[PDB]
Design a protein around this ligand. Structure first.
Ligand SMILES: *[C@@H]1O[C@H](CO[C@@H]2O[C@@H](C)[C@@H](O)[C@@H](O)[C@@H]2O)[C@@H](O[C@@H]2O[C@H](CO)[C@@H](O[C@@H]3O[C@H](CO[C@H]4O[C@H](CO)[C@@H](O)[C@H](O)[C@@H]4O[C@@H]4O[C@H](CO)[C@@H](O)[C@H](O)[C@H]4NC(C)=O)[C@@H](O)[C@H](O[C@H]4O[C@H](CO)[C@@H](O)[C@H](O)[C@@H]4O[C@@H]4O[C@H](CO)[C@@H](O)[C@H](O)[C@H]4NC(C)=O)[C@@H]3O)[C@H](O)[C@H]2NC(C)=O)[C@H](O)[C@H]1NC(C)=O
Ligand SMILES: *[C@@H]1O[C@H](CO[C@@H]2O[C@@H](C)[C@@H](O)[C@@H](O)[C@@H]2O)[C@@H](O[C@@H]2O[C@H](CO)[C@@H](O[C@@H]3O[C@H](CO[C@H]4O[C@H](CO)[C@@H](O)[C@H](O)[C@@H]4O[C@@H]4O[C@H](CO)[C@@H](O)[C@H](O)[C@H]4NC(C)=O)[C@@H](O)[C@H](O[C@H]4O[C@H](CO)[C@@H](O)[C@H](O)[C@@H]4O[C@@H]4O[C@H](CO)[C@@H](O)[C@H](O)[C@H]4NC(C)=O)[C@@H]3O)[C@H](O)[C@H]2NC(C)=O)[C@H](O)[C@H]1NC(C)=O
Lengths: 207, 207
């Protein structure tokens, strides 16, 4: 009956000390007559006792969805500690365990290139600015466009794709009106990854 | 299980008359006891007669996989016919079903731009040729690289991404030795998609 789902922190969260990276253990499909769900958290095998279990919430399909949220230290996540959520409930034969961590393997620093649009992309009102980020590991990364300090709206990012040698690459596309690229605005592609200095770099682009 | 998955034909196959496009019904996790799975196959409400059930496979999860494949007309699939696979096995409460067809909607043709390498990237031994394919619908597409008629090995393609307007885009990345880029070789990105004239377009790139 009950299914357990264990979610990692957001990459922008693990990479900036101002933010609060958290692991979330989500139990769904808990019957009405065995609703008491117990949680235990282990960090690299030692039980931790500081997780905040939000009070159960009855779903419209007549099952309880219960959530528990453990906060993690940024150096704990990035040093490769394993997080074991252990969910016990009297609807279960025996308790369910789920574990989560950063990806094993040595970090690799992404190279960041910014490509300008094709000449064939001038006969349009809109134009595509491209940012290639390649050779990074593990694949937790964050890509963001801006110009003149303010963020950009119209950008899309592919998912991280596996190259032959084990590392990852992706592309981010910023659609801008040809006018602004003509005028000469500078657009910037900002990349946040653990293997970067200050965890952040930025590449700029203009006519 | 018995849990049913239904897959569509590969794109390349539905776009050339020479290849054979098949829809593929996969029953993961059949039990050793009562392993007799059955299949039936509806095309737009007409039972068809020519399916090829692959005998068995047996997994290291002491359970079985039972694939049936059904071959399809190229115009049948491109015209949006529904392909109904129905699975009868006594271990199931009642017959399972699944359906598949092409994404509904007006096919939109891809725009194909090729981007040269970044100036930054030329201080390396290897170099990334990029190919942006954008504006296409439905998202079944094929992308390949070639030079002097002969194919390329070292290219990877991102899966297709949804833009705000309902079309898709992707990038292909070919990794070549900076020496070949300078000798002046001509590299070609070849796109195969059902909205293109002759289902095929091709863009070229050189120093
Ligand atoms: C009864 O209802 C509840 C709740 O639904 C609510 O009420 C009903 C009535 C409807 O109106 C609902 O629409 C309504 O919202 C049902 O609860 C659902 O249960 C299903 C499964 O039964 C769960 O599916 C899983 O979803 C996860 C991803 O979930 C994230 O994204 C969802 C949107 O897509 C979002 O709704 C989720 O809440 C969650 O969002 C994240 O939440 C965390 C914490 O809150 C947060 O930190 C994140 O930031 C946030 N993200 C976003 C984007 O918002 C999905 O990953 C699961 O897929 C995995 O598991 C499958 C096996 O179960 C497997 O087949 C998949 O392929 C995939 O497998 C994983 O694969 C990776 C590799 O890619 C591998 O590494 C992993 O090991 C592997 N994992 C596992 C476990 O195998 C899965 O699809 C829903 O999340 C859940 N919804 C909610 C809201 O809780 C309940 O099921 C209903 N009961 C029924 C129908 O009987
Ligand atoms: C015990 O063993 C078996 C055997 O597998 C073994 O275990 C796994 C974990 C691996 O280690 C294997 O190496 C190993 O062999 C396990 O059985 C598996 O269980 C998982 C659990 O979810 C199933 O996942 C499903 O996968 C299919 C897609 O399967 C393709 O890709 C897989 C990854 O490459 C690959 O394994 C398959 O062979 C298959 O490959 C395709 O094959 C076709 C021909 O058949 C070929 O033409 C294609 O080219 C090829 N493609 C690729 C990419 O390789 C996926 O469809 C399922 O997703 C649906 O259902 C989920 C619910 O379970 C749900 O979360 C998903 O979101 C999705 O649901 C749909 O979502 C869409 C999208 O939004 C939505 O619109 C739809 O409404 C919704 N529909 C439905 C009906 O849900 C799912 O992800 C595996 O199929 C299954 N078998 C294998 C071989 O993995 C078993 O789990 C093991 N026990 C464990 C792990 O505890």
């Amino acid at each position: 009956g009950p299914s357990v789902f264990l979610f990692p922190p957001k990459p922008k969260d693990t990479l900036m000390i101002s933010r609060t990276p958290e692991v979330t253990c989500v139990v769904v499909d808990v019957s009405h007559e065995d609703p008491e769900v117990k949680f235990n958290w282990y960090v690299d095998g030692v039980e931790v006792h500081n997780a905040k279990t939000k009070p159960r919430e009855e779903q419209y399909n007549s099952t309880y969805r219960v959530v528990s949220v453990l906060t993690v230290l940024h150096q704990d996540w990035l040093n490769g500690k394993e997080y074991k959520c252990k969910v016990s409930n009297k609807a279960l034969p025996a308790p369910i365990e789920k574990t989560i961590s950063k990806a094993k393997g040595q970090p690799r620093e992404p190279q960041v290139y910014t490509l300008p649009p094709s000449r064939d992309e001038l006969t349009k009102n809109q134009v595509s600015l491209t940012c290639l980020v390649k050779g990074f590991y593990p694949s937790d990364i964050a890509v963001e466009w801006e110009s003149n300090g303010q963020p950009e709206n119209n950008y899309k990012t592919t998912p991280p794709v596996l190259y032959s040698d084990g590392s990852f690459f992706l592309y981010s596309k910023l659609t801008v009106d040809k006018s602004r690229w003509q005028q000469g605005n500078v657009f910037s592609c900002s990349v946040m990854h653990e293997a970067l200095h200050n965890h952040y770099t930025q590449k700029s682009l203009s006519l």
